[PDB]
Design an enzyme around this catalytic site. Structure first.
Site, short mmCIF file in Angstrom:
data_model
loop_
_atom_site.label_atom_id
_atom_site.label_comp_id
_atom_site.label_asym_id
_atom_site.label_seq_id
_atom_site.Cartn_x
_atom_site.Cartn_y
_atom_site.Cartn_z
N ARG D 39 -78.46 76.26 113.97
CA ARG D 39 -79.36 76.44 115.06
C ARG D 39 -78.85 77.03 116.32
O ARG D 39 -77.53 76.62 116.68
CB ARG D 39 -79.86 75.12 115.36
CG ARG D 39 -80.73 74.25 114.39
CD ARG D 39 -81.19 72.94 114.95
NE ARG D 39 -82.15 72.07 114.13
CZ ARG D 39 -82.54 71.00 114.25
NH1 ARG D 39 -82.17 70.45 115.36
NH2 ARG D 39 -83.39 70.35 113.39
N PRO F 1 -85.21 69.14 117.46
CA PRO F 1 -84.52 68.74 118.70
C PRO F 1 -82.81 68.53 118.14
O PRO F 1 -82.75 68.08 117.15
CB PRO F 1 -85.04 67.52 119.12
CG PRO F 1 -86.40 67.74 118.56
CD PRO F 1 -86.47 68.06 117.10
N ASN F 2 -82.26 68.50 119.37
CA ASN F 2 -80.81 68.47 119.15
C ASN F 2 -80.29 67.44 120.49
O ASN F 2 -80.72 67.68 121.56
CB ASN F 2 -80.00 69.85 119.25
CG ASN F 2 -80.30 70.57 118.10
OD1 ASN F 2 -79.80 70.47 117.02
ND2 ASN F 2 -80.81 71.78 118.51
N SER F 37 -85.85 66.09 111.75
CA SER F 37 -85.75 67.72 112.64
C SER F 37 -84.86 67.10 113.65
O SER F 37 -84.43 68.34 114.32
CB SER F 37 -87.20 68.10 112.95
OG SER F 37 -87.46 67.16 114.29
N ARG F 39 -81.12 66.43 115.12
CA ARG F 39 -79.80 66.42 114.93
C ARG F 39 -79.16 65.75 116.19
O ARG F 39 -79.21 66.23 117.44
CB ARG F 39 -79.25 67.87 114.93
CG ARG F 39 -79.57 68.65 113.64
CD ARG F 39 -78.91 69.86 113.48
NE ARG F 39 -79.31 70.72 112.34
CZ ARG F 39 -78.84 71.95 112.04
NH1 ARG F 39 -77.78 72.64 112.62
NH2 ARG F 39 -79.13 72.64 110.85
#
Lengths: 62, 59, 61, 59, 63, 59
Positions: D39, F1-2, F37, F39
């Site tokens: 990512r 999303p992170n 989804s 992280r």
């Protein structure tokens, strides 16, 4: 000019330097900046402190 | 007003905590911000994880 | 030596300019790191994307 | 892996696409990391907020 | 104490309000920190600037 | 999303687990992102390098 990498721990010291140079050469290739102002920061995160789908990397085989 | 400093490994315990007040007073001073609002945390990156012109600090 | 400041949006451009070298010098002083290598990234965050005690900077201040 | 690249604001959306590819490809072949696990995000900084040696890029 | 989220643009500001609350709520429920020491930095990234598999998020149909 | 959380030292690997789980769940019910989804990584800071108002978490 500054590339920050977040990634799971365990990669060889020579993989880490292969990355630093490879990412610098991507920016200098693609944007055309001078390698001099490129900073590559590698953040090893331990497998007990990195999570995917609510699960630690460790419980995921990582 | 939160600040993160990325520093290569090898600094003294005395000079790290020293760095924090310096960076904090600099924001108070420049942008008129209250002290109790600025948090400063130092991120300590090993010499084999800090790259300069494609090369590691180790090299 | 790279510095990144997360701060609420609205600060003047002179205040921003004032902040970069202010942080730069402070680092050169206490750590002995040449100005040559002190990079200072300033990130504005809209009031609706900054959180204090789980509240947005808009609804608080 | 995850990459956050800090860039100054003078790049087009095509250059930015070409850079996410380049960075993704670099990680794939310095490390044997699969591409679909990488990512990449670009954090675009205005030139008045990007400091190099006490001086803004804008200066 | 500081939580930072990197996420594709497109969400409502009303949603970012829940996010800030829910994240802080979760971090005080779990590790016993004070609410007043928790900051949430929300950093939206446009389609054109976010990538997966070397493709942009716009080309994957996300934003 | 992170998600990156900066945490002071002293947390259990087991406490780190439930935080990742909690940070993840909150993101699912807030922005309807599927949990697989999201992280999450905790970037842990020694008390001596995390500063509040110019002074570290050691006092």
């Amino acid at each position: 000019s500054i590339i920050q990498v977040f990634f799971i721990a365990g990669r060889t010291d020579e993989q880490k330097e292969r990355l630093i140079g490879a990412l610098t050469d991507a920016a200098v290739k693609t944007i055309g900046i001078d390698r001099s102002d490129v900073r590559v920061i590698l953040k090893d995160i331990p497998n007990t402190e990195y999570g995917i789908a609510g699960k630690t990397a460790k419980s995921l085989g990582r | 007003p939160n600040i993160e400093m990325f520093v290569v490994e090898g600094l003294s315990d005395q000079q790290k905590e020293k760095l924090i007040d310096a960076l904090t007073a600099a924001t108070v001073e420049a942008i008129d911000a209250p002290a109790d609002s600025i948090r400063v945390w130092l991120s300590e990156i090993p010499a084999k994880q800090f790259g300069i012109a494609g090369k590691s600090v180790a090299a």
